[PDB]
Design a protein around this motif. Structure first.
Motif, PDB file in Angstrom:
ATOM      1  N   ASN A 153       0.855  -1.219   0.000  1.00 21.48           N
ATOM      2  CA  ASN A 153       0.000   0.000   0.000  1.00 21.48           C
ATOM      3  C   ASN A 153       0.883   1.259   0.000  1.00 21.48           C
ATOM      4  O   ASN A 153       0.542   2.207  -0.739  1.00 21.48           O
TER       5      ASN A 153
ATOM      6  N   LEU B 223      -2.678  -1.413  -9.235  1.00 19.68           N
ATOM      7  CA  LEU B 223      -4.124  -1.728  -9.058  1.00 19.68           C
ATOM      8  C   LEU B 223      -5.006  -0.627  -9.665  1.00 19.68           C
ATOM      9  O   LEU B 223      -6.096  -0.975 -10.165  1.00 19.68           O
TER      10      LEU B 223
ATOM     11  N   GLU C  58       2.543   9.094 -12.104  1.00 20.64           N
ATOM     12  CA  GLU C  58       2.432  10.195 -11.106  1.00 20.64           C
ATOM     13  C   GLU C  58       1.085  10.072 -10.378  1.00 20.64           C
ATOM     14  O   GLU C  58       0.083   9.730 -11.042  1.00 20.64           O
ATOM     15  N   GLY C  59       1.078  10.323  -9.062  1.00 19.21           N
ATOM     16  CA  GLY C  59      -0.104  10.206  -8.185  1.00 19.21           C
ATOM     17  C   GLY C  59       0.066   9.113  -7.143  1.00 19.21           C
ATOM     18  O   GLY C  59       1.222   8.711  -6.890  1.00 19.21           O
ATOM     19  N   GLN C  60      -1.048   8.647  -6.564  1.00 22.55           N
ATOM     20  CA  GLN C  60      -1.095   7.647  -5.461  1.00 22.55           C
ATOM     21  C   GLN C  60      -1.690   6.337  -5.989  1.00 22.55           C
ATOM     22  O   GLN C  60      -2.637   6.404  -6.799  1.00 22.55           O
TER      23      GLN C  60
ATOM     24  N   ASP D  47       6.559  12.263   1.834  1.00 20.24           N
ATOM     25  CA  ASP D  47       5.828  11.876   0.595  1.00 20.24           C
ATOM     26  C   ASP D  47       6.683  10.910  -0.238  1.00 20.24           C
ATOM     27  O   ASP D  47       6.131   9.876  -0.665  1.00 20.24           O
TER      28      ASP D  47
ATOM     29  N   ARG E 123       7.568  10.817  -3.244  1.00 25.29           N
ATOM     30  CA  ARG E 123       7.244  11.104  -4.670  1.00 25.29           C
ATOM     31  C   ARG E 123       7.628  12.549  -5.016  1.00 25.29           C
ATOM     32  O   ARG E 123       8.087  12.768  -6.157  1.00 25.29           O
ATOM     33  N   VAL E 124       7.448  13.489  -4.080  1.00 26.22           N
ATOM     34  CA  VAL E 124       7.757  14.945  -4.250  1.00 26.22           C
ATOM     35  C   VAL E 124       9.164  15.226  -3.704  1.00 26.22           C
ATOM     36  O   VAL E 124       9.498  14.688  -2.627  1.00 26.22           O
TER      37      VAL E 124
ATOM     38  N   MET F 251      -2.642  15.411  -0.081  1.00 27.81           N
ATOM     39  CA  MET F 251      -2.674  15.292  -1.566  1.00 27.81           C
ATOM     40  C   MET F 251      -1.753  16.354  -2.180  1.00 27.81           C
ATOM     41  O   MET F 251      -1.612  17.436  -1.572  1.00 27.81           O
ATOM     42  N   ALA F 252      -1.159  16.049  -3.339  1.00 26.78           N
ATOM     43  CA  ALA F 252      -0.321  16.966  -4.148  1.00 26.78           C
ATOM     44  C   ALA F 252      -1.094  17.386  -5.399  1.00 26.78           C
ATOM     45  O   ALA F 252      -1.950  16.637  -5.866  1.00 26.78           O
TER      46      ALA F 252
ATOM     47  N   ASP G 203      -1.496  14.885  -8.461  1.00 22.92           N
ATOM     48  CA  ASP G 203      -2.671  13.975  -8.355  1.00 22.92           C
ATOM     49  C   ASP G 203      -3.924  14.770  -8.741  1.00 22.92           C
ATOM     50  O   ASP G 203      -4.140  15.846  -8.144  1.00 22.92           O
TER      51      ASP G 203
ATOM     52  N   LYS H 125      -7.489  12.265  -7.059  1.00 22.26           N
ATOM     53  CA  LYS H 125      -7.513  10.839  -6.637  1.00 22.26           C
ATOM     54  C   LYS H 125      -6.560  10.649  -5.452  1.00 22.26           C
ATOM     55  O   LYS H 125      -5.359  10.949  -5.612  1.00 22.26           O
ATOM     56  N   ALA H 126      -7.081  10.173  -4.313  1.00 22.99           N
ATOM     57  CA  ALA H 126      -6.338   9.917  -3.055  1.00 22.99           C
ATOM     58  C   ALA H 126      -6.523   8.456  -2.632  1.00 22.99           C
ATOM     59  O   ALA H 126      -7.675   7.979  -2.654  1.00 22.99           O
ATOM     60  N   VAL H 127      -5.426   7.783  -2.259  1.00 21.89           N
ATOM     61  CA  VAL H 127      -5.404   6.373  -1.763  1.00 21.89           C
ATOM     62  C   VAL H 127      -5.102   6.399  -0.259  1.00 21.89           C
ATOM     63  O   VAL H 127      -4.027   6.905   0.114  1.00 21.89           O
TER      64      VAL H 127
ATOM     65  N   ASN I 267      -3.935   4.428   2.645  1.00 25.26           N
ATOM     66  CA  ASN I 267      -3.155   3.246   3.107  1.00 25.26           C
ATOM     67  C   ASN I 267      -3.577   2.890   4.540  1.00 25.26           C
ATOM     68  O   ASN I 267      -3.652   1.683   4.844  1.00 25.26           O
ATOM     69  N   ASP I 268      -3.843   3.903   5.375  1.00 21.07           N
ATOM     70  CA  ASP I 268      -4.302   3.756   6.782  1.00 21.07           C
ATOM     71  C   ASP I 268      -5.825   3.564   6.798  1.00 21.07           C
ATOM     72  O   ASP I 268      -6.514   4.234   6.001  1.00 21.07           O
TER      73      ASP I 268
ATOM     74  N   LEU J 292      -9.168  -1.353  -4.043  1.00 21.17           N
ATOM     75  CA  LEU J 292      -8.270  -1.649  -5.195  1.00 21.17           C
ATOM     76  C   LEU J 292      -7.961  -3.152  -5.267  1.00 21.17           C
ATOM     77  O   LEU J 292      -7.846  -3.665  -6.398  1.00 21.17           O
ATOM     78  N   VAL J 293      -7.834  -3.828  -4.117  1.00 19.29           N
ATOM     79  CA  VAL J 293      -7.436  -5.266  -4.026  1.00 19.29           C
ATOM     80  C   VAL J 293      -8.618  -6.134  -4.480  1.00 19.29           C
ATOM     81  O   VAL J 293      -8.465  -6.856  -5.487  1.00 19.29           O
TER      82      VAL J 293
END
Lengths: 658, 658, 99, 50, 100
Positions: free
Chosen positions: A510, A534, A559-561, A649, A651-652, D1-2, D5, D8-10, D12-13, D36-37
């Motif tokens: 994750n 995914l 790029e992104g999450q 982050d 990524r940044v 979020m940046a 993106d 769209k935010a994921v 994990n927690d 997603l899984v």
């Protein structure tokens, strides 16, 4: 600037004088020794990679275009008496200087009026630039460019030289250009009014029959057929060029050897006292000479649009008024003749300085691309904050030398704020996805690359989308001088990651940082792992680049999450040391050490060996017989470095003032 | 005076020598970062424009007409012996000086009698003025003027070049004038009695073939075709001009370059010792080089009728008395050569000094037009109280220098009270209605503008009645140095509009001051607000300019009672980089902050970059320290030796310094 | 010419006026190119010794020698052992040991 | 979020995902997340009382 | 290391030539040089049994200068130490242990 670019090379490597280049592609790297040590919950395992080759690939192919622009005057070589107590050119003292050095005093009022308008536009950098390009066309004039050759080749995708370079044919480097000759006329002493828009240059003794043909072709238009780095399109410098030679000039021969071009440059600099003008042209060619071969297919986005080379306008008034140039010249730095003395001794050393410069730029642009556009230092406002001079415009060399300062982390200083050379940051400064044209080699291409057509056939020509520009080169010469978390180019490092629970035969990662550390370990052990993104539904692979044996996070190509589903059952065994394990358990610890570095170069799938003797150091001290350091730190260009501050982050990237 | 016009330029502005003007329109300004904020009971909405361009458009066109007037004599130049203690020509020492000279003995008694009239004819300002105009005509000769071109356009009203300037044919600046040459005769030293009403000048050595052509055209009628600012109408200065040059005057060449005019000026000032005359001519041209393009459509009232230029009559009697001019001249101020020395070094700096002067004047005439006649310092009597000298008539340079003194808030000092140049305050002092012509674009024009017709079909030629003159330029170079609440040119500003939820968006501004600040800040935020007056029933729009991007209260085009209804559900987003007011409720609080400033210039919708060397602040001391130095190094060719030093190879030689 | 004399003797030469008139010698040096001197041969075994243009030349033939680096035109005689260098080796006492 | 993106935010927690989805419902916003899984969907509007 | 002009390195001194070919043998590079005086080819791989180079393998008492062929350096026995292209001052430090 020899001493600047010479410092970029690694401490262990000291290259020899000559280098017989016989191809349009050269690999450069080192053969290091890696001593890995693995520990997890199952137990311990110790191995050793005896010989590992990490290398980039650099070529002589790059689409460039010349534009004639107006830049600052270089006030070096003019007599010291015309300058006042400060570093300023006073017209009150020019009238006096011209008056004392003549018997005919009728012409002093006329001479002063014309001199005042011409002295503020004197620049011979564009003439030396073309003269240097003519030297290397004759020397390495047996390099073949084939139109239906490969540019990049991974296995899934392929780029040919038909694409990226349309309007091109098959030709050698000597067969590329058919240069015409500009009129080299003789300036008879007695002419009272200098003809406008024609420069006049001094010369030692008689202008040789061969020297005429070189000056004639240097000023003429460059119109290439094959895309070559040192044969790029340049506009016509001048129509005429006067030469104040006491002995009359001889007619043009037509033919000249590469050795004859050295004699032409050495005389032209010595007579005109244009040593700082040569230093500008030397740095300006170091950018253009070589271009990178991209690391991955996405890194071809840099080299689609033709980068503009800013060539200064050719103007000089030494031939008309030879009284202004005398035996006591004005110079800001005391090491102002080092760059010419370096080139005339070791001409082939420019290749190593060029590779060192373009590597430093394309490595650091890898970080600048990842900076968010909502901070103090971003892609738009990084040059403006760095520079501490007053140039015409933040373009050309100023952009490149700013990136070298950010890489090495040292303050770079030039005597004059010159803004002339290639600008690279063109593809970067635009909020648009770039359409790289590619060829399909395997049927399963759309799964890996972000292709337009999701169904393809072997032989079809499709297009792939690139949003964020990935790194074009990996650090090789600049390896471990300052280590960022992104590249992870350490000598010694202890990577620690916690393995995700393997449910069926799949492990969900994750977090972004943990995924980067996991695939980085498995690559060093030598396990070809394949994971599924995914969100997008496209397959990522740690074995993306074969040349440089490391994994960057930009190989995901999104790029992104996101969250990754790693296939733990289909873990292939490509390269196996004794350390290499397939089944990780619990908390994975990998501690490696790199020792025994030795530089090696490959050309045309054989070893390229350096010839000649050992390079002895030429360098001048800060003082010759000068008492007080008159700082004069008002006009001089200074470039301040930025340090990367890592944050959560990953990524940044973010820059801060040290 | 170079010194006082230099101080007007901003602190951040660092000018260079050369400026390559290739058009008849320049948008000078600066780039600033504006951090806007909108606070409300619901919440705060923040915006940020990183590059905000505030500009003032300046053209090279403007109708002017020269008239020959009688002005005071400038006594700087004559030998210091003939002057008394008080500082006036003591006649008796003149007769003594002429007697003990190289004059013909039979001429002494007859020449001494004439001295009483002829020695008080010293004013060369008219000649230097015309010779400066010839320099800039030949330099910027390629600029064009089209007949059917757009002088002003704001969407609603349009004003063409045909409207303001009839009898106007389209032509380039070089092809505008066709100057006939005046006779340049040689003065016979053995002439019986001096011929008054014919000026005689001095010269160093021989009058060159090109100097004859320049002096011939300088003393002639200017009859232009296209209405250019540096080629305006001037009467014939003189018919014949004597030149006391023992070396004969060569005949007229016909052609000359701009560098040859600088040669002619430097010889004329040096021979005649006329530096104060040049300082007067420099300030005259600074006024009438460039005219401002009007900010609003109704701000064209300033340029309807032609403003008269006061050129003092050409009168010089140095040719008849060569003995009275020598190397020890009489001067009032010690820094009397500073203005010439500045021009010879940096000719193109006059463009920056010109825009600085007109921007200072037209800003102050903006807030002088808005005072009632019943007051101490008013429209008619603002020059008299400020001036503490004895000029002939309060016109020309006195009215322009007193407006600059009010703007900067400093004391301006000149050596001689000279009253020559353009008079701007013409349309103001009349105090009547001006009828400006306009061609309409839309059909709903006469609600906004105070038009003569109430219904007008598109493409009709109408007339607007302008009563009170609005400001022609917004302060840009003089931004936040002497701030007034009318322009509101602060770095930080805020406005509080108080509304209750019971009101359905509709707010009435009883106060006039905060209505101006609300409408101005809303335009920075990129919002098109349209208020309607409750008493009269007219309408005002904040978008009434495309240069500065501010709202002045004079855009209402009516002085009455203040009751402005603004409906805040008809606010439209027009520009990019804007904060949105979707639906406000409660008290609104608008605010902005300007942080940094960067100088920028535009021409032909492209960036105009400054090139050449770094301009310095030339002082009188910086040259005369090199005169104190004299280069006192005894001019003796001392050749120092070099001892050869042998090392391992012995084949190659190495020289040491000692 | 005066600056070359200053290097030889190792003293400071002073003139009252900085006059720049007379012969300029450093012409063939500053060019830095090959010079083609003509020669008439005597023996037949010439081109082994001299860097000649032809490899076989019969006696009485007009040939050309390629001179790249300029050799010394005169040996020091008047300036013998006043400012000695190891190139000319103009010592009063000298010795060599061939092993 | 940046900003890179595009909305769209994921998460994990699991803990802060619960608090985000809950507070967005107080603010009267209908959020629909997708796992997603597995590939199932969850909606914060799953009650009309609390 | 002597400067490699074309593909040939001139070793004028006798001691330096002995040390050079002694290093290249321990690395395992079959180098062949030409004696300029005699005009006969010398080889460091003369004896296979004892893995060392003696100066008497030149087979010429007296003084000479050697022209080493750097392009035709064959690779007979290669450890990880073994390199083909030497550059500048060559340092080789070896240790012998575990005799049986």
């Amino acid at each position: 600037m020899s001493s600047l670019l010479n410092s970029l090379l690694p401490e262990y490597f000291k290259p020899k004088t000559n280098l017989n280049i016989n191809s349009s592609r050269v690999q450069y790297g080192f053969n290091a020794r890696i001593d890995m040590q693995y520990e997890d919950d199952s137990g311990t395992r110790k191995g050793s990679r005896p010989n590992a080759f990490m290398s980039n690939t650099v070529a002589f192919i790059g689409n460039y275009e010349g534009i004639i622009v107006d830049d600052i005057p270089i006030l070096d070589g003019l007599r010291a008496d015309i300058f006042d107590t400060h570093g300023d050119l006073d017209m009150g003292l020019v009238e006096d200087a011209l008056s004392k050095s003549t018997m005919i005093r009728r012409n002093v009022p006329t001479y002063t009026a014309y001199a005042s308008e011409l002295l503020y536009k004197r620049n011979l950098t564009s003439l030396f630039y073309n003269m240097l390009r003519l030297y290397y066309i004759k020397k390495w004039g047996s390099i073949k460019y084939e139109k239906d050759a490969i540019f990049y080749d991974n296995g899934h995708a392929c780029l040919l030289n038909r694409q990226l370079f349309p309007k091109s044919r098959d030709a050698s480097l000597e067969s590329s250009l058919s240069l015409p000759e500009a009129e080299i006329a003789m300036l008879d002493p007695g002419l009272e009014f200098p003809e406008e828009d024609v420069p006049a240059i001094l010369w030692h003794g008689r202008v040789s029959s061969r020297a005429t043909c070189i000056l004639g072709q240097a000023c003429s238009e460059f119109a290439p057929l094959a895309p070559f780095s040192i044969a790029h399109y340049s506009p016509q410098l001048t129509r005429k060029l006067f030469v104040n030679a006491p002995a009359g000039i001889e007619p043009s021969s037509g033919r000249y050897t590469h050795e004859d071009v050295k004699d032409a440059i050495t005389i032209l600099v010595s007579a005109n006292q244009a040593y700082t003008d040569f230093e500008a042209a030397y740095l300006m060619l170091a950018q253009t000479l070589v271009s990178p071969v991209p690391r991955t297919a996405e890194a071809s986005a840099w080299f689609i649009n033709a980068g503009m080379v800013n060539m200064p306008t050719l103007s000089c008034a030494n031939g008309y008024y030879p009284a202004l140039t005398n035996v006591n010249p004005y110079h800001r730095l005391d090491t102002w003749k080092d760059t010419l003395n370096h080139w005339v001794a070791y001409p082939d050393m420019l290749f190593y300085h060029s590779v060192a410069m373009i590597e430093s730029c394309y490595v650091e642009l890898g970080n600048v691309a990842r900076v968010s556009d909502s901070d103090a230092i971003n892609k738009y406002t990084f040059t403006e904050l760095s520079v501490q001079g007053r140039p015409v415009m933040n373009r050309g060399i100023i952009v490149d030398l700013t990136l070298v300062a950010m890489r090495t982390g040292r303050e770079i200083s030039l005597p004059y704020p010159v803004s002339c050379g290639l600008t690279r940051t063109d593809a970067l400064l635009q909020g648009t996805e770039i359409h790289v044209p590619v060829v399909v080699k395997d049927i399963d291409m759309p799964q890996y690359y972000n292709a337009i057509d999701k169904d393809v056939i072997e032989g079809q020509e499709t297009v792939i989308k690139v949003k964020q520009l990935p790194p074009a080169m990996y650090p090789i010469y600049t390896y471990g001088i300052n280590t960022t978390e992104f590249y992870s180019d350490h000598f010694e490092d202890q990577v620690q990651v916690e393995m995700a629970p393997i449910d069926n035969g799949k492990a969900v990662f994750n977090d972004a940082r943990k995924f980067s550390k996991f695939m980085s370990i498995m690559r060093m052990m030598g396990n070809d792992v394949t994971a599924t993104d995914l969100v997008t539904g496209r397959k990522v692979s740690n074995w993306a680049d074969n040349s440089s044996g490391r994994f960057l996070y930009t190989d995901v190509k999104y790029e992104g999450q996101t969250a990754f589903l790693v296939d733990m059952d289909t873990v292939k065994a490509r390269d196996h040391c004794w350390v290499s394990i397939v089944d990780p358990n619990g908390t994975m610890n990998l501690s490696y050490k790199m020792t025994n570095f030795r530089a090696a170069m490959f050309s045309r799938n054989k070893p390229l060996y350096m010839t000649g003797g050992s390079v002895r150091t030429i360098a001048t001290g800060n003082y010759r017989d000068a008492a007080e350091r008159l700082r004069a730190m008002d006009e001089t260009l200074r470039l301040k470095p930025f340090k990367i501050t890592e944050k959560l982050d990953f990524r940044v990237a973010a820059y801060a003032i040290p």
